[PDB]
């Protein structure tokens, strides 16, 4: 057919794109559906039973966070495609579970398996995408496309779930979604064909050494703070809007829509703009624009007042992510051994920590401290961390550091 084998290496791009699409679709659709099921079942330790609502998000977030490094080691331990297929199967089993699912304790187990699959895919597919694309500009382009797929998934999720749920009922958004997962697996089984183990030719650097590299840490912190911006912004915007704006129910999706559209636009154009213009300066501008936008958000007074800053923050987080994703591969190729699993695991740890500590901590900080103060402190953190991206202009090579050490002693 169109792909008898990996005749086009863009087939791997398509695989990763649709995998991330389906993963964030599972992540987003269940969010408004959990409270309805929980309330209906409860109608038909109470403080614990209330904070367990946020424990829903915390479950997937923490499972992903814990699971990333083990998958990163596993990829170069035995090979790339097998973790992708295993994470596929785990995600499919979880997806089949959510629906038949009823009991709360089983639902948490289901979404924990979802997190296992999400982490495994986001590590293995990303690493294999980096490995097949050794060219810097092409790697940046394909990584921007994959992040654009992530953003488009998180944009399409909520209405896709809501329309089917309101049309048929409970299992409708889940069964067809699992069928799309099965179609992905039918593609994968012939595209990858991992019917034999492929041990890695070159041994990987220890993970502890990577955490000692300052530039990897700078890029990881940039990604972490930029994602924590929108992650913290997600819960607290509707409640503050209801408190001060005297608003209604339906403005919420329209108000957050600019952020997702701008994310989708940013991650697909800045993949090709960054290499032409410069990754470090792109990251610096992204951080600065994130800070300005988040600073401007509390000062607004009408919905039209919030239209512009959400567009700005989406655009800027898109720049930061699409410019700092391939710099991990660039650095590990420049001054380390060419194995990308561990470094991309670190990058995804930074990515997921924001979603992990966003909702609950932001709610608590809003409870004890003014929400405008939350936005201002986030903006201050972003602005003060922005100049640290300057160090990524021309990193020294491993030979240079060896010579520096030999001059020291």
């Amino acid at each position: 057919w169109l792909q008898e084998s990996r005749r086009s290496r863009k087939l791997i791009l398509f695989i990763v794109f649709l995998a991330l699409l389906l993963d964030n679709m599972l992540l987003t659709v269940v969010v408004p559906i959990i409270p309805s099921y929980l309330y209906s079942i409860k109608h038909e330790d109470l403080l614990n039973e209330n904070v367990q609502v946020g424990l829903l998000f915390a479950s997937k977030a923490t499972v992903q966070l814990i699971t990333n490094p083990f998958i990163g080691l596993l990829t170069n331990r035995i090979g790339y495609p097998i973790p992708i297929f295993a994470g596929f199967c785990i995600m499919f089993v979880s997806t089949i579970m959510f629906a038949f699912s009823s009991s709360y304790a089983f639902l948490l187990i289901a979404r924990s398996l979802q997190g296992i699959g999400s982490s495994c895919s986001s590590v293995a597919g990303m690493g294999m995408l980096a490995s097949v694309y050794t060219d810097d500009e092409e790697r940046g382009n394909v990584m921007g496309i994959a992040l654009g797929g992530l953003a488009m998934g998180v944009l399409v999720g909520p209405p896709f779930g809501s329309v089917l749920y309101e049309f048929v009922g409970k299992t409708a958004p889940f069964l067809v979604l699992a069928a799309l997962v099965l179609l992905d697996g039918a593609i994968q089984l012939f595209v990858l064909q991992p019917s034999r183990v492929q041990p890695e030719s070159q041994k990987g650097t220890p993970l502890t050494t990577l955490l000692k590299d300052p530039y990897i840490l700078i890029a990881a912190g940039s990604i972490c703070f930029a994602n924590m911006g929108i992650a913290m912004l997600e819960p607290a915007l509707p409640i503050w809007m209801m408190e001060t704006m005297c608003s209604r129910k339906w403005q919420l999706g329209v108000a957050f829509l600019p952020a997702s559209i701008s994310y989708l636009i940013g991650t697909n154009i800045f993949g090709i703009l960054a290499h032409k213009m410069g990754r470090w300066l792109c990251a610096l501008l992204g951080m600065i624009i994130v800070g300005v936008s988040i600073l401007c958000i509390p000062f607004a007074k009408n919905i039209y007042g919030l239209i512009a800053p959400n567009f700005g923050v989406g655009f800027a987080i898109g720049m930061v992510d699409s410019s700092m994703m391939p710099i991990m591969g660039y650095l590990v190729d420049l001054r380390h051994v060419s194995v990308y699993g561990s470094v991309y695991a670190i990058a995804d740890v930074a990515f997921c920590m924001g979603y992990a500590i966003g909702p609950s901590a932001g709610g608590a900080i809003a409870k004890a401290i003014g929400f405008p103060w939350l936005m201002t402190i986030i903006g201050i953190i972003d602005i003060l961390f922005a100049p640290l991206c300057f160090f990524l202009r021309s990193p020294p090579s491993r030979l240079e550091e060896e010579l520096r050490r030999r001059t020291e002693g």
């Epitope: 020294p396 090579s397 491993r398 030979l399 240079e400 060896e402 010579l403």
Partner: nanobody, 121 residues
Framework: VQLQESGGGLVQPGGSLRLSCTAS???????????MGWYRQAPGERRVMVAA???????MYRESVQGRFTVTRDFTNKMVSLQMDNLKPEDTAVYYC?????????????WGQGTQVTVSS
């Protein structure tokens, strides 16, 4: 991989001298992959690094030699060379040539014949 060099001599303090090390036994591409410089050893003293260059073209001079030495590596002529503009009596040492190749973890080092320079006091 074999290398050659020339230089050395006796001169009063304040003079000038030029040292050049040649690498004609290895190809240009492998020469670019490697890193090279000039070694230094004194009677009854250990090696302490003075000036080396790499494919970044960055030379980390030792703290006391900044400005005193001048080193340049040729990517085409296969020569690493040193130029120096000032002398002091504390320069009693013997200078060697060397290379590093860090694609292997052992970074196989190959030394040159070496040159000795002493300064009258």
């Amino acid at each position: 991989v074999q290398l050659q060099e020339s230089g050395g001599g006796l001169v009063q303090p304040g003079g000038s001298l030029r040292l050049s090390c040649t690498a004609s036994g290895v190809t240009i591409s492998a020469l670019n992959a490697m890193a090279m410089g000039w070694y230094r050893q004194a009677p009854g003293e250990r090696r302490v690094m003075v000036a080396a260059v790499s494919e970044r073209g960055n030379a980390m001079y030792r703290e006391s030699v900044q400005g005193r030495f001048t080193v340049t590596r040729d990517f085409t002529n296969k020569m690493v060379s040193l130029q120096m503009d000032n002398l002091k009596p504390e320069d009693t040492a013997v200078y060697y040539c060397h290379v590093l190749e860090d694609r292997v973890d052992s970074f196989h080092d190959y030394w040159g014949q070496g040159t000795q320079v002493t300064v009258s006091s």
